[PDB]
């Protein structure tokens, strides 16, 4: 009564506010439910192999167009699978790959001294990663011949380079310390460098 | 009530449930009575994107208006099922249901718990169903029967001149069918969508028409006589499925490996052209190859170096179409080859429509697959014509299925009305009351027709009912001067089984609507 | 001051759902909107047809006097506007000119329809009257032709005909563009059984104005020759649809080495193989090569040793068009071609055409399935305007190849039709005589615009033209920029028109009219 | 028309019709349950946390928070009816809404409402003459008015309240200044005395006032009292023209102070002299009452005297006591005689809670009396006040004329039958409205069937077929539903009641049904 008369006249009490927030949130919640079916035919590339449970009609215009774009995508992605073995170049050439390493290609510049299970396990993880991402340039070597008399208490130091610009750093075991460190966590860190797009729990 | 448990629970009591259902149905019937009949209004339904479709079809009318009511949702669902089954007079369904509920409202306005009305409606439905079984007349299908059936049932969803041209085209259409096989289905006949010219140019094609033209500027634009090679063999390049690569020491080794790569397409092409020449190619004996897979430019050039006809990527049903049009046996591999697989076409040419280039095959000796071409001013008119021809072919199928045609244009339902009135003092009780209104139920059908025509309702109605009562025949409704006059003599009928299913569904949905007692929005707590 | 809305249809709408019903809401609103749209662009497509410009969302400028582009870029919220613009687009797909005629005629017919529904006729009566008048017009129209098209081959006839389509642009110069278009089209038309509009392309150059444009039987490419040697007088042209590089495996062509001599002759054998291939291709007898794909530096080196011209293109359309033009052939292999499959040109010159590098093809044979038009101007909008005029002329020519029937210009035909259809509709029974007569009277809207643009008084000259049409003249129409009532003949001045364009225009216009008048209710959903 | 003012509600013909129909349906359906001695009992809550128990229609209309055009018209019309007659006002809205519902079924059938309007006016006229011819006279006696009061008291309240109030009202109308001239109840007041049982309300001869001795040192019960009715200032007054006192010593202060209370004391000495002249000793009662106030000085001066004084009473109190005690009201003391005095037999005081009361009874010939309502609950007090008002209204509408008509559906069904038989005379589709108009009165008994618990059509047809050769004066029973003659129990109702009922209902229905368009203009953007 009196409060709503106040409301017509004044705004001294606030009580009619904030009832639009949950309204808009629920609107968007109902809206975002059509994204599952919007791209049902626009994601899978095996739907042709999924005959008799995916076909209702074929317009042969946008769907053959989908095959065309899909095959272009496939050829573009499989023309780049050239790697998969971490390689040991020498320090003499080092200037030629710190700089002349290709523009638009990430370089995981790994430096290490073999012998500690830290460096050994890190080398194992990156070598196994090479089996998954053959589109990434891996480099392994002895830092002593890469950097003269490099402090041996600063290994293994991960370097992320492209066009001579350091984008990501992971210096020493201070960020990799522990035998509990695993495959997916390394992949997670290199994804966080901005090179890879994947998903992990933690 | 449960609203105590769920503060976000919307509850509508039994009386409230009936009230809201009735309001929804009344709105639906008021907007739908504008549709059926050759005099029903034609509306604009436009989406937010601006997509415009102009229709007289109740179903597409339903699915492009803004609907909100769960009861209205169920109405649309059942009407859509009816349209799926036969697709004609769909408006009659919902109008009948709405007015049945209206009469039930008029009576429930005096207490009178509705289950008695439901059972009385069931009994009256049974009696009227037997009456319909009696009243229907049988005449075997022919030129006049089917042409008049199409001309009559077509105008429920489309105008007049289109109805006439469509009737002629569909008379020419259902003739490539078997004698006694009933080979008619949508899987077997195709419709062309091409925005080319006005409506006075639409026709039909016994043969087949494809939207794919020459892949290379050496092909043939027109073949006098062609032998057809439908094939389901991969001709484009493919990768070895174990991912094998090339390892060599010399560039000439790379050359030899390239030759090794090409040899397989080479010998497939060799086999195909060898069969072509062996059958014949000389002296204007065109050869056509039909594949649904890719073709390499290497294979394209290899086959086209001698000007063969071959194309790519047609609809998968076109392979059935061609088997029953050209006659040649289909194939999936060249393990076994014989000129038996060769099809035949009496004329092939091309005509490029705008950006798109079209091929046409025709002069089929025994065509079992035919296609329909329609050209109109724009998209909305072509969608409307496509829907109209779909429903018209549905009606033609329904007519040619059985050999019984019921008269149309309002006679049969007033006949049912009077017959049910006669039977009424035998229904044993207050259900007669419902039965009474139940007769008044069918009362709407010419009434709406009378309503659409602008004639005053009660006078024409009592005229019609008196005309039927005095005689025993079936008198129809005039749509030019309103004067009662029988309609079966000008070529007016309607599908018997269609009305059977109509009455079935209408009664079932009517009792389902009337038997509601509680409307909830349970959930979202 | 409290009142809700009616339960029922008004209460089952969506929140964003809007609706118009009956003669009141739907009919008056769409009729007024259509009249607005017709009046917006009712000042163009004439001898004085005043060009109008517009800015788009894409922030590109457009100065057009044919309604097609300006309406297609413009967006609306009125469905009937979508109907009329789609009608114009269908006209364009049929012929592609005079997009203002359909708009003016539609506006006039919708005005008359609103008047008739004010009178109180059934929609069916008016619609059927208009359809009767439509088919009667279809029947009487072919009886009105004069001086149909003879050959479509001579140059002067092409000038005289296409200039008529040209007056809609560039009022201050006519004959120059006529020469250009006539020469180009006579060069390009096979004159036997077929044609494609794609067979003609044009090229634009920034710089001097129209005074320096030209036509070349031979394409224009801006590309630059890789090799030093350029511009042989007349020579053979080898064309490789495949890339210029050597045979590369479409799979991985890896190499493995076990001993030293393999490496010792690795590059030696590579260079020898490409040397042999390039040597054979040179021994084919040509000196001109235009590849499709990228170019190999060492193969280019051998070409230097063999003195070969190299050009690489991007458009496969251009590649096939070259095959059509110079007799070139597509070879998807690096194998040397045969002399039958050879390209030929009397001039392939790499030159500068206004401080822009150009590769010009020219034949003394004057042959080729495509001939290019070099355009000269100072601003891109001028390019667009001249290209629109050129397109009007060339599509006039293309649609006139077939359907060589002609129609008088100057608007006399429309008034003849109006008078005749009114005379016929004077006898119509029922209540459709009003519709049939007003259909005819609607043919006064086109001369209304034709008189308002030229700066002359409209109704005076309209009355005079009716007076002289009472004498029965199909060829008397307004004098341009007269400023004083004066009319004369048009066939004298070549002021003419095509039959098929007008026929399609009127047919589509009537279809749209019946379409819109058959609409009885409008339902809109929630806006996107 | 949302263009001239973008914010304005514009509704077309059917929109206005539908909203009016829906509002009328809601109102009538709500008010079905509020008539008969077996109607449903309504509880209402005001905008403060205060509760009223009502069976009255106008109370319900003006307590509902309802903002609607038709509802506003209903509230105004029912307010006027309650003002004039004030009984069975439910019938008004029931008739109006039922006629609306009827005419809906035919306007929906394309009948333009004007024709139904002329049909309704013809039905008005014919039913008017029928009721005029079947109206029957009877001399107004005690038992006749007992039955008439029982009618309305069973109408608006329950049994025992009716049992006491019939007696109360019939005795109330007996007390009158002039039997042969119109009675008025402003001389017969109602006072609320909220401390006793619901059965303790009764009628008291004379008047009782709520204010007592403003200078309490007085007696407690006096007998054989003479009455002084004065309207003069008995308290100190300052002259309107401003002035002040001036002196120079305290002796002048004493003189002026003692001379400033001289005029009022002269007045009270006049009064005391008149008292002693009228009666000396022997303890004869002598009551003085002034409309205006009395200052404490003269208050004590007269309280030391045995005289009792009353001040600040209601303005109509004195005007009615003028007749009640037989005295003449005094407005100044310029002349005076004992004739202007009134008299009473016994006067006593009684205390309760915070207030006390002055009882004036044993009037020599009671021509003004007072009704006292004693009850626990204030809303109960108000409900009993409404009941007594309805009873007095009914007895007045009975006595004013000399004619009365049977109720409880009897004459209703009578004119129903008469109009059904007469309808063959009237012409046009308006005839149908007449039938609907007939159906109008049919709502009246059947709701009683709904208020009794019987099948509506069963009882309706029993009563309709009860018609012998002559028109039986047969209504509906309240315990068996079987047709029963009205005269046997003797429950009737006033003629002009149903007369103005028909007048108002017909005219308001015309106004509702002639409307064309609804606006909500007047919004300054």
UniProtKB/Swiss-Prot annotation, chain A:
Modifications the protein undergoes after translation, according to the UniProt entry: N-terminal methionine acetylation destabilizes the protein.
A GO cellular-component term linked to this record: protein-containing complex
One GO term of the biological process aspect: chaperone-mediated protein folding
Keyword list, A-Z: Acetylation, Angiogenesis, Apoptosis, Chaperone, Cytoplasm, Endoplasmic reticulum, Phosphoprotein
Region Interaction with XIAP, residue ranges: 89-91, 145-147
Record PTM Phosphoserine, positions in chain: 35
Family membership: Belongs to the phosducin family.
Subunit structure: Interacts (via thioredoxin fold region) with KDR/VEGFR2 (via juxtamembrane domain). Forms ternary complexes with the chaperonin CCT complex and actin substrate, leading to inhibition of actin folding. Interacts with XIAP (via BIR 3 and RING domain). Interacts with HSP90AA1 and HSP90AB1.
Protein name as catalogued: Phosducin-like protein 3
Organism, as annotated: Homo sapiens (Human)
Swiss-Prot record, chain C:
Catalytic activity: ATP + H2O = ADP + phosphate + H(+)
GO molecular function, one term: protein folding chaperone
Phosphoserine, modified sites: 21, 160, 211, 267, 315
Residues with the N6-acetyllysine modification: 316, 398, 464
Cross-link Glycyl lysine isopeptide (Lys-Gly) (interchain with G-Cter in SUMO2) per UniProt, renumbered positions: 222, 252, 258
Cross-link (Glycyl lysine isopeptide (Lys-Gly) (interchain with G-Cter in SUMO1)): 457
GO biological process: binding of sperm to zona pellucida; chaperone mediated protein folding independent of cofactor; chaperone-mediated protein folding; positive regulation of protein localization to Cajal body; positive regulation of telomerase RNA localization to Cajal body; positive regulation of telomere maintenance via telomerase; protein folding; protein stabilization
Keywords: Acetylation, ATP-binding, Cell projection, Chaperone, Cilium, Cytoplasm, Cytoskeleton, Hydrolase, Isopeptide bond, Nucleotide-binding, Phosphoprotein, Ubl conjugation
UniProt keyword Acetylation, yes or no: yes
Residue sites binding Mg(2+) per the record: 97
Entry binding sites for ATP: 98-100, 168-169, 410, 497, 502
CDD domains in the cross-refs: TCP1_theta (cd03341)
UniProt keyword Cytoplasm present: yes
Record's subcellular location: Cytoplasm; Cytoplasm, Cytoskeleton, Microtubule organizing center, Centrosome; Cytoplasm, Cytoskeleton, Cilium basal body
Chain positions found as Phosphotyrosine: 28, 503
GO CC, any one term: secretory granule lumen
Binding site for ADP: 45-46, 98-101, 167-169, 410, 497
Protein family according to the UniProt entry: Belongs to the TCP-1 chaperonin family.
NCBIfam families in UniProt: chap_CCT_theta
PANTHER family: CHAPERONIN (PTHR11353)
Pathology noted in the entry: De novo genetic variants in nearly every subunit of the TRiC complex, including CCT8, have been found in individuals with a broad spectrum of brain malformations, and clinical phenotypes ranging from mild to severe epilepsy, developmental delay, intellectual disability, ataxia, and other features of cerebral malfunction.
UniProt subunit comment: Component of the chaperonin-containing T-complex (TRiC), a hexadecamer composed of two identical back-to-back stacked rings enclosing a protein folding chamber. Each ring is made up of eight different subunits: TCP1/CCT1, CCT2, CCT3, CCT4, CCT5, CCT6A/CCT6, CCT7, CCT8. Interacts with PACRG. Interacts with DNAAF4. Interacts with synaptic plasticity regulator PANTS.
Curated annotation (Swiss-Prot), chain D:
Natural source organism: Homo sapiens (Human)
Protein name: T-complex protein 1 subunit zeta
Catalytic activity as recorded in UniProt: ATP + H2O = ADP + phosphate + H(+)
Positions that bind ATP: 36, 88-90, 408-409, 493, 498
Binding site for ADP: 36, 88-91, 155-156, 408, 493
EC annotation from Swiss-Prot or TrEMBL: 3.6.1.-
GO CC list: chaperonin-containing T-complex; cytoplasm; cytosol; extracellular exosome; microtubule
Key word Calcium present: no
Gene name as annotated: CCT6A
